[PDB]
Design a protein around this nucleic acid. Structure first.
Ligand SMILES: Nc1ncnc2c1ncn2[C@@H]1O[C@H](COP(=O)(O)OP(=O)(O)OP(=O)(O)O)[C@@H](O)[C@H]1O
Ligand SMILES: Nc1ncnc2c1ncn2[C@@H]1O[C@H](COP(=O)(O)OP(=O)(O)OP(=O)(O)O)[C@@H](O)[C@H]1O
Ligand SMILES: Nc1ncnc2c1ncn2[C@@H]1O[C@H](COP(=O)(O)OP(=O)(O)OP(=O)(O)O)[C@@H](O)[C@H]1O
Ligand SMILES: Nc1ncnc2c1ncn2[C@@H]1O[C@H](COP(=O)(O)OP(=O)(O)OP(=O)(O)O)[C@@H](O)[C@H]1O
Ligand SMILES: Nc1ncnc2c1ncn2[C@@H]1O[C@H](COP(=O)(O)OP(=O)(O)OP(=O)(O)O)[C@@H](O)[C@H]1O
Lengths: 362, 362, 362, 362, 362
DNA sequence: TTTTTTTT
């Protein structure tokens, strides 16, 4: 009796698997009797134990197949096709709505029965970030708007300050939240072709540490980034499509995603100052260092740099109406759980401790 | 029974879809009951909802096939082959009548029963655009004719002027009108010597932000582009056909399209000046800023960058005589609606509001 | 019943089509009934309407094939194999037979139904060229047959006159007539090696105006260019093969093609001077330049840079018995066309205008 | 009858083989009579002699197959697919316990009765290592935690000291313990592209003997290592994912591994001190050298370089609780075996011999 | 009925054809009705007309095949396989007999009834060559024997003398006779490495015009070649294998083949002098240039560059026993033709007339 | 056959 390629493709759709090897590896695990599947019994991976019983019968036949890689290839192509269809038809608003559902699904697991995440430690992170700048949650909403609206020539935010001032920590959390990618421009001009190629079909991008010149005035080593960026105004402006690379592949042509650039205190040509719609400056603060020193689970679990921490901040601080109609349903459930499990006094005790530079918990 | 690759390819032709993954994904949607189909019920996407009922039966059989990418590859190749046969056999006017049919079909949808936008906003756009430069509508008709007759040497156009003078905005609108592609000239030539290969089978191209020495005193760094374009005489003059590059695929040789170059105000070598038909000398125009500020919907919906706005302008301004007979039928029929939906006093009142720096609507 | 692969191959041979997508696109059109075929009715394209009725039955069955691109790939291989067999086997004269026909085929278009070129202004080019120097149709015929015979040492002509005296412009016209390419030698010696690689397999070559040292005093741009040529003894003589080089690619051996050198009036080592068959003075002549200034279509349509204008000069002046033995027949309808379109008196009047320096058609 | 592909896939999995040729060559050996297999009888290779009898029947049929390389390719994919599944789903602690279990398995052979090694010599090596630095075993534990926790911007240790002072010796042992790669960055900036590609999916990296610039008064050569590192800040900090390269392969996104930098006595920017968690100063010491000369079987067998030696040190020194839970059973058994075979006096005698610079053994 | 792949393999072998496209093209020509074949009837290409009559029936069936290129690929592989087998197993003696048989076949054509050149024209060539140096025939016999034995150290011959003194003329004819490559070592040390790669798997190499440094006392321009050669001593001595490299490609290891060195009368190191078997001095002699000046068909037909002329000289001068037994029958036939064609009186008249420096013929 | 190499 033959393998159902249909059942395989459906698993890859359900789990959104992009990699033929990852798909192959995981589907093989289903060959063993789910009745005794130690992994299922220990509930260690949703993408396994949700599926093993359903796929077991087909996986036994797949284990014998001589075609295996071909079956997986067709499955991955279907998931890739679904992505291109979506990328060419969704509004950016709908795209963000989908991303939030993915994160909320992960949160339901993290704080779920398996429950590995202590929501107390995660909410401590929210207090730390809300402390990092005035009106923090308002600034996040402004960033989200302009990423959604993607207004031409008003498309990039500039993060500037001295070192150890948290700007890349914030950028990392924002980047996880929207699911962009990071890129280098402190490079020779040739290499940029395949480098910038990975921006293909991403929602957002981040450029790090772009280097000005004469920076040794400020002990900054002078470098390529700023002058490479003035060579790229059109990619910033997003006013027209551009052509993007891959090895062993043709171009694809598209408008280039919006995003964020991070800066030591170099000087900048005003052609670029014209193009950054907004700038915010970060400045070091002693009590934050003391707090982290007392509370290193914030770093060790990477809480302060996760988009999950930003999402919790928004759920706490923003009206339900600021979210799209579909997710408002889930937003309501999460607002309930947070309010129930964190009395305002608890959060105030936390935010107090952070401001004092004390260990957040007491 | 078995998949009709014929019915597949008919969809590919009729959608003009020429991406194998896009096609693959698109067709797979039809596997579900069209009678229940939520996208059909929404009338969400024309390239779905017109076809779902027709292709449903074949797509069910497609959904079980094991040849799925191979089926799509043949289907895409007939679409691409059709473009090739057209690209040599059709006369340039005939090409434009095809392109204008394409844009009119979109306009039929946009201002269709969905009212996906309101033409009042787009006509405010027409007013804002015609407000840019003297006799604006007329200059476009001259440029169109230059690209039609494609006369050698007198074959390229310069836009010169400061940032936020709108030259890129004009360029974006013209390219969205014609179809064609952009390129960057500010490169080492042996890099550009592959990128020029993009021009294949295109009607038009545009070259962005040429840089040269003698700008750098004005926050306007020099670049290779000025000398590159001075040297790219073949591509410019169009007095002969030239090679165009590809990867894992053969080159071809053909006439290089006509086109436009944009500059901020570097110098120009006189022989390169002499290779233009014309130059146009963009400026700030202060009250437009004020209008735009109120008129945020203009940029949010990208109206003033989009060739659809130009098409509404030429319909509004030009004699019905300016077009080929078959489209003159559609021109007349569509030109009716503008009276049904505007008085001239409204159009006057709009351009007045523009001139007055008001929000265009009242 | 089945696709004849044979019939597809015949059509590819008859079209001499060497593009698989083009062949695919073309042949698919025959699947509709030839009996109504509107391209046939309109007699638009012989490569269609000559063939449809024969191929129709096979094209229908072809359109149902699942293998289509494979059929076409074999057909294109056949045409490429044919070219390679001939390319190895045939003589310089037989190859000249080809580029002759290619140039006549272009003229049948350029002055055909489109009227894209004004045959009068182009024959006025023939006149203006013919008055540069003595008997120019003979001077061409002498040079041309010299390039066919490719006799060792007897292979290179020198142009030596001051600026604007025509050598560059003439060299351009010569290249259009012939194909081939020009070359730079005004260089440090390392560069010459890849430069010379351009000559590989060219039917003719040129050397760009030499930086002759012994030009310093003449206020000419000057240097090793001439001493490089004097050093490169053997390549000109072409008695024996030599190696040639391309970047990122291996060495190759050729008899170095025959060609032309041009200069302003440098002083010359008589060793190098002894290598030439002819050296030709050029004088700037007021009547020539002022006629051009009165006749600028000659420049704008680059008629004087047209090698096709040289082919007209052959067709007009030279006797039928001088052209390629059988293709002489094809020349006579061209002579007949020109003889009908142009009395000798109008060509004479034309020459008499430039004989007054008056614009040719004035 | 037919080949069981499944049995081949099992053999690949059981041997964890992932070279197609190694797998092929290995499997082919089973085709001869198991009952006479001299390799089995001589008990030379366990990956042979465990398996020949099981696989024999299928190996004979495989020997006749016409598909041999395709059969092997599917088997190697299965092993590679498992590695990627693990790379995404395992915790860093689990990865380390898997690595430990494999070393412990290798130790079981070496000190098996069939084993070649002498546990007294291997224990002698531990005495030399525990003399190389203060509190050596505690330093190993602190480093292991540092790599398991992988705390961003607290991920890298700096080894520096004179030449012939044991830094690369110690790095090699840690690298064999954990698995990882060494890398060279005293390079031109371009080859760094592919060089950093080597880090892909590794656990550790070691940057070996980076060169500073200047201060050749220190007798140090100069090179670009430190100037490259001061650029590569993002790869050290490990705050965000980066994109890595391989020849003929498209760019791969992951967070960059933690690791070690080794360096002779160059001075260093504080910008790089700011990125190293800890700095260890190695020093040359006479009694180590004098002991080592008399104890040179240590060198001959590479005992001092090898991760087995560090693992033995941890088993001797560390409490059982510090090992992850599942291995505590095996660790206890090895502790008992060590105690059975060495008194404290023997170990303490060895250390005294090392301190006295006599040969370790007596 | 079916294609015989064997018949295609045989044709490919007898024609020694290496190109798929070439073989494909050739074989398709046999499908047209053999009896009418104008190519047969003109008797031009022997690789056609010797075979068309035989292969005709198979060519018809091949013309209908669906997998034609696969047939031709296998045939070409058979030809390529035999070449590598021979490269590894032939004696140098046998290689030369094979090389000679090829030339003898071309001579049977050139002087057959269809032969376009005339044997009297070529015997004029032999007479002129015999006058260039004393004992010319015996010199050539010695040189060939030297290459055939390839005795180490006794491997290389030196040509020196003024410009236009015939040294490269002779090298060309020898290289045409034996097969091989020229090389240029007037280079910096880096470029030599790829240059020496040209020698890979050749029979001879010629180092052309290695310049010495200094010696402008003789007006010889200085250059590095001689200094480069004195480093390369081991390549010349030929006593042990060397490593050779090519662009994009690996090393190869082999004995560097024997060859010829040419130059003007530079100084020599005594070390380099000792590495040569013989020095042969060239000098201008006026009666040769006056003879050429009155028999330029020698140059025009490139007779004196040709190894065919050398082979003709060997046949005229040397005993039958000096040839290898395999070809002695063809040699005797060719001698008998020549003796019947020319009386000694004719040849003696030619030689004397050349000594008078008059045109060869009377 | 690109990409890597080579060109630089
Ligand atoms: N505002 C701040 N004041 C004091 N310490 C800070 C602040 N922000 C971050 N930190 C500390 O600095 C560490 C590094 O933060 P981060 O990498 O985000 O800084 P950065 O300025 O963006 O750095 P870089 O320019 O090197 O990328 C954090 O882990 C935290 O310990
Ligand atoms: N003539 C104008 N006067 C004032 N503002 C203008 C004008 N034209 C455009 N703008 C503003 O500048 C923005 C950018 O316009 P656009 O990119 O077309 O200008 P540009 O001159 O081509 O600029 P750049 O050289 O930076 O690409 C527009 O979206 C609009 O907000
Ligand atoms: N003999 C001539 N007398 C006058 N005008 C001429 C003559 N020959 C050419 N012309 C015109 O002068 C232009 C420039 O001529 P051209 O570049 O061919 O001269 P050149 O001798 O090669 O010059 P240069 O040495 O400056 O490059 C031509 O394109 C043509 O328009
Ligand atoms: N602390 C030490 N005291 C004395 N001799 C030492 C010491 N460490 C190493 N040696 C000797 O130096 C040899 C080389 O050791 P190793 O290669 O680790 O040196 P290194 O200085 O750390 O090298 P590198 O600079 O290349 O990393 C050892 O085999 C041993 O003979
Ligand atoms: N010995 C000679 N006496 C007189 N004329 C000669 C002699 N040898 C060659 N020639 C003339 O010189 C021309 C060039 O000959 P050739 O290329 O062989 O000279 P070469 O000195 O060996 O050259 P090169 O310096 O390039 O190695 C010949 O075609 C002939 O006209």
């Amino acid at each position: 009796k033959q393998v159902s390629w249909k059942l395989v493709t459906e698993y890859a759709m359900e789990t959104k698997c992009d990699d033929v090897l990852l798909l192959l590896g995981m589907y093989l695990e289903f060959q063993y009797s789910f009745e005794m599947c130690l992994k299922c019994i220990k509930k260690e991976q949703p993408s396994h134990y949700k599926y093993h019983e359903k796929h077991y019968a087909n996986a036994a036949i797949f284990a014998d197949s001589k075609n295996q890689k071909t079956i997986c290839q067709q499955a991955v192509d279907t998931v890739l096709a679904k992505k291109r269809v979506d990328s060419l038809q969704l509004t950016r608003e709908q795209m963000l709505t989908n991303r939030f559902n993915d994160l909320l699904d992960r949160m339901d697991i993290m704080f779920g029965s398996t429950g590995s995440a202590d929501i107390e430690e995660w909410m401590a992170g929210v207090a730390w970030l809300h402390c990092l700048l005035p009106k923090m949650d308002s600034v996040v909403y402004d960033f989200l708007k302009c990423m959604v609206y993607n207004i031409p020539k008003k498309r990039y935010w500039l993060f500037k300050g001295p070192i150890d001032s948290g700007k890349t920590t914030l950028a990392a959390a924002l980047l996880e939240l929207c699911g962009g990618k990071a890129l280098n421009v402190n490079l020779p001009l040739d290499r940029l072709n395949f480098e910038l190629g990975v921006a293909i079909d991403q929602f957002l991008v981040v450029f790090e540490d772009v280097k000005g010149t004469g920076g040794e005035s400020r002990d900054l080593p002078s470098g390529q980034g700023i002058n490479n960026l003035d060579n790229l105004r059109d990619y910033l402006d997003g006013s027209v499509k551009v052509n993007l690379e891959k090895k062993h592949l043709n171009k694809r042509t598209q408008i280039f995603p919006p995003g964020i650039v991070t800066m030591n205190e170099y000087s900048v040509p005003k052609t670029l100052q014209a193009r950054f719609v907004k700038q915010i400056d970060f400045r070091p603060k002693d009590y934050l260092k003391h707090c982290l020193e007392r509370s290193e689970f914030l770093l060790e679990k990477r809480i302060i740099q996760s988009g999950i921490a930003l999402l919790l901040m928004l759920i706490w601080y923003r009206p339900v109406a600021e979210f799209a109609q579909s997710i408002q349903s889930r937003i309501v459930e999460w607002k309930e759980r947070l309010d129930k499990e964190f009395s305002l006094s608890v959060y105030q005790k936390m935010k107090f401790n952070v401001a004092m530079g004390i260990g957040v918990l007491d």
